[PDB]
Amino acid sequence: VSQLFEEKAKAVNELPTKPSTDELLELYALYKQATVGDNDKEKPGIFNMKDRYKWEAWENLKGKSQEDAEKEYIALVDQLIAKYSS
């Protein structure tokens, strides 16, 4: 369930060891996935090549998002908090 998702995800977004560059993409994709639950903001910006890549990796899971995110998410963020706690 998405309960533990919002336990863990809300930490990694604002941890003092903020998420690393290639890990951030996965964490965006999956965080945005279970957070809003659908493809939501279908306009990442114009020069926004970063957001366009992240949003594409998100749109990959556009419909089923919530359900796959919540189960994958725990096993991402626990090994991330292991790096990122302090």
Rounded-to-integer distance, Cα 73 and Cα 9, Å = 8
User: Does 30 count as an annotated binding residue?
Assistant: yes
User: Does 10 count as an annotated binding residue?
Assistant: no
User: Does 71 count as an annotated binding residue?
Assistant: no
How far, CA to CA in Å, does 80 sit from each of 19, 51, 59, 74?
A: 8, 21, 23, 10
User: Does 27 count as an annotated binding residue?
Assistant: no
User: Does 53 count as an annotated binding residue?
Assistant: no
User: Does 84 count as an annotated binding residue?
Assistant: no
> Which residue is it, tokens 């292991």?
82
Binding-site positions for an acyl-CoA: 28-32, 50, 54, 73
Binding-site positions: 28-32, 50, 54, 73
